[PDB]
Amino acid sequence: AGIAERRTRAWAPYIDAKLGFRNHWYPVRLSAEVAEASPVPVQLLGEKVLLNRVDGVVHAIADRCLHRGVTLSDKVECYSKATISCWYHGWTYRWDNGKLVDILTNPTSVQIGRHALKTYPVREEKGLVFLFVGDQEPHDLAEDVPPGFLDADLAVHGQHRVVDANWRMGVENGFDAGHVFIHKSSILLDGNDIALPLGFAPGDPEQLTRSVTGEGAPKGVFDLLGEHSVPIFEATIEGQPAIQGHMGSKMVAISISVWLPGVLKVDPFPDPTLTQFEWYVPIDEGHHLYLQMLGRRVGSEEEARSFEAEFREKWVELALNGFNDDDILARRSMEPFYADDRGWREEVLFESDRAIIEWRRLASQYNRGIQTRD
Amino acid sequence: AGIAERRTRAWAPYIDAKLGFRNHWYPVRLSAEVAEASPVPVQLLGEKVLLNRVDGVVHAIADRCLHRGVTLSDKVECYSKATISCWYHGWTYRWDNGKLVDILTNPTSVQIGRHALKTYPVREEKGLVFLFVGDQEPHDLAEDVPPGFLDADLAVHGQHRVVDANWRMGVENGFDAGHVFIHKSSILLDGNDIALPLGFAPGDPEQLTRSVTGEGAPKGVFDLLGEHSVPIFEATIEGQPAIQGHMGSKMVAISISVWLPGVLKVDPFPDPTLTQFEWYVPIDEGHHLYLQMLGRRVGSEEEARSFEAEFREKWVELALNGFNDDDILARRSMEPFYADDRGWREEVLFESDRAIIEWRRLASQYNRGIQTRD
Amino acid sequence: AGIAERRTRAWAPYIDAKLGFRNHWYPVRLSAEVAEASPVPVQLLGEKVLLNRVDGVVHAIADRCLHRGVTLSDKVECYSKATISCWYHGWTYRWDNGKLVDILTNPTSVQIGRHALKTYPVREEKGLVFLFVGDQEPHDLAEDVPPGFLDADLAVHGQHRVVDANWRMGVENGFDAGHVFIHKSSILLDGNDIALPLGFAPGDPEQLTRSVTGEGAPKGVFDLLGEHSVPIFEATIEGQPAIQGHMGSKMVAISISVWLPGVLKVDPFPDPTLTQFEWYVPIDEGHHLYLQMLGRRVGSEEEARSFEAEFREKWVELALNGFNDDDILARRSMEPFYADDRGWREEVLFESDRAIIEWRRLASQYNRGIQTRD
């Protein structure tokens, strides 16, 4: 085999991370989806969680009763503002600390006050509810999101969908330095007079990327293919004309970078005034939550309401769907090749794949843990 | 792990009985569903059987041809009153002894008279067709049904449904001594003026149950929680009023018991003039046949026709469905927790679970065999 | 059991051939389904292939890009007559030799010209496109089809359907002499005055079959039960009248034979003026492509157009479906019994099964390889 072991050695941990990285923050829902006193069940990294907002504060608990292991969310019953009672025998837990404070069906039980559901640390920023999945004290959320995502003046809006592919197919697709070819028919092209070449003739391999590995700040890789190559706007087949790219006035996706636990930052995009952020949150081994966020620097309540309107009325359908919908096929089609780990050894990479290789190495070395099941 | 082994030790056989107990009688269909010369296929304990009534007598044979292993019931063909002929090559077997008595496609075959389909002992009582699944001589049916079920004066009617959970989830749910909380919204409460607390404050653990262990009579456990506890009608959470039970003049479920191979007896229920009997017949590892029978002592053919009409016009929708429908969620929600055996070790039981523990111990020690595949 | 090992010894390879035999020709589609410049994906023996007709010539290549392993046919894109370009990063391959001749997204890539998709030898005869699946040089197509199928004067037409069963269930069912019992109610019987018995009373087991194993020509088995038995047109059950066959004046299925890699020849059928040929091409372990071809010796372009018309207007619904639709249930019902290999040991065969046994032995000894999937 190895030949293959030597080639994949530096990313063995990544190859094993079918369920994602443990001990990191992950966004799971939009703020508006988690309303006051209205529990919402979610699943991430194979773990079933139940969310709820109490007095404006979002709380997260394991979505499973400690008694007979039923799923609490199968029939949500709350009889006090701060608690949820299991629908089977009334074991009652607090949302803030998961403690079993009462048992409606037997107030004399010696089990009362002796147990607690697992709770997940929560952070709600930029219209997203983030959960920390791990066993160690959480580090700052800033270390798990792209640089600038938490900037005070950055207005953010987004949407999410479930993709039938492992989360890694999402990140591989998202940070793939030379895949613009798949977007050559996007309505966003002439819809926003954006320039989109067919591909790139890469320069020196050592110049194509830059990695950030310091402590106290997000760790990731910058894709520098753009400034170190000759954009391809026309290509031939066996010497004959075959196809052309799409030249336009606006140059976007000037700075592309990916960060642990696996979040993309495309700047500027889909317009010189916007920045796109993407997450590929693991749900289970065969699915991921593809979260697409668009941000715009705002200086007043007025230009904020303005961006909000432009987001829903234009960008969602023109870009988030009009441009990115073609990415889903890529993820679904690569899925089977990599689902059994064979792809990591059999793939035949070329020049523009240097960036993903650097991401695989960095992710393998700096992730805070490999999520596993039982 | 060692603490788990010691705790589950007395019921390890039960943990392995995913397919039920072998060498016991099991009801599979209502008498009316097995009509004269109208073969009906069934599956119990993972075994596929074909039933038919010939001259009033119900017969049961393995639902698989000895030749090429096809399922006989895929296309039932009978060319003589006493036989069934496989639809593929005409191997012909007698219903009464499973004997290969003819081969329509080759009357001179040396195989004729040299083989026989497996046959299952049958007993038809109280409108139910019972099959003995096992290799030893059948003991009396009375030993596998609750006390009184076969009383000459008991008029019986019932219905069944397939539940998406292991049979043990059905029995655990049925004999769960303190689960009335799940039935607090049943239309039966107001519908039949039945009292229903939210739970119970159990007395001495040693007084909560009584076990009966053969020989020559059904073996099972009596749930004595009602007699040794304080009914819980008012529930609180952290000192504040949370929810309340329901008052009624009719007292039901005075006596609850479960018997091997796994049948419940609730008396009286759902009315002082009735008794409910429940079976959780294993179909395969993930499904069971939930059989609900209601019995009423009758003294004349007049009050028999009366009970029959009441059963259909009132009790089926008011109780069998109106009360027990909420039980299905419980079985389905516990299913995954116990399907991989981890639930038996990870569950956190409390006081009212003494009864189910006594059942698991009794079932483990006295079952006549563990049904397996291969 | 040692008894089972000894019994199945002579056909152990056949038992392992769940995916079919490697190094043989297999028909995959009708010529009309593979049009000029209109790529069509197919799957045989677990391998995904992409077909296309360029300048009237059919080409076949592996349906998977060498780059990231996506399925090319998920979005066919051709920018030059002789090539196909992957929809993801534009790697471009020639249909005739699978060579990676260009990479639209990076014309300077060092990978260009250093790789080639696997190609499959192709043969197009009698309105069918045959593919050779193997690693060795292809032998003559004539060695993998029934005798006379390629005769110059044989006009051929047919249809195919995917069947939910392993390919062997198709061959087993096809070359089975006692199976005519399943066809006793076929509309073809009265519809064409066909004489179809219920079964047969075979003679010496030694003259029931004849094998052909010479080199240079197809290898197979001739079913000689007909010319060596007493056909059963009426049969009794326990001495009493039970069922009758279907006498007629048109004699068909006079000569039945099966040939490697697994193709049946029934002559004449479904009419004295026709010959039926059937293929059971493995798709994957649980499905096969059931190809039904009808041939008629023709001497003029007029009777050729006449047969073509009769095929469409009469034989398709009266025989291909009217007669063979019943064979499908047989294959599906046997499927589970043999899917886990238990069937080969537990089946109880009788006299007329001598023919299938001869096929299993011949197929085991002469197949050119067992197809396997890592």
Ligand code: FES
């Ligand atoms: S399973 Fe939740 S209170 Fe019993």
Ligand code: FES
């Ligand atoms: S499979 Fe039943 S008679 Fe042949």
Ligand code: FES
């Ligand atoms: S996956 Fe086909 S060119 Fe990249």
Ligand SMILES: [Fe+2]
């Ligand atoms: Fe899915």
Ligand SMILES: [Fe+2]
């Ligand atoms: Fe993309």
Ligand SMILES: [Fe+2]
């Ligand atoms: Fe099911």
Ligand SMILES: [Fe+2]
């Ligand atoms: Fe209940």
Ligand SMILES: [Fe+2]
């Ligand atoms: Fe299928």
Ligand SMILES: [Fe+2]
């Ligand atoms: Fe047939």
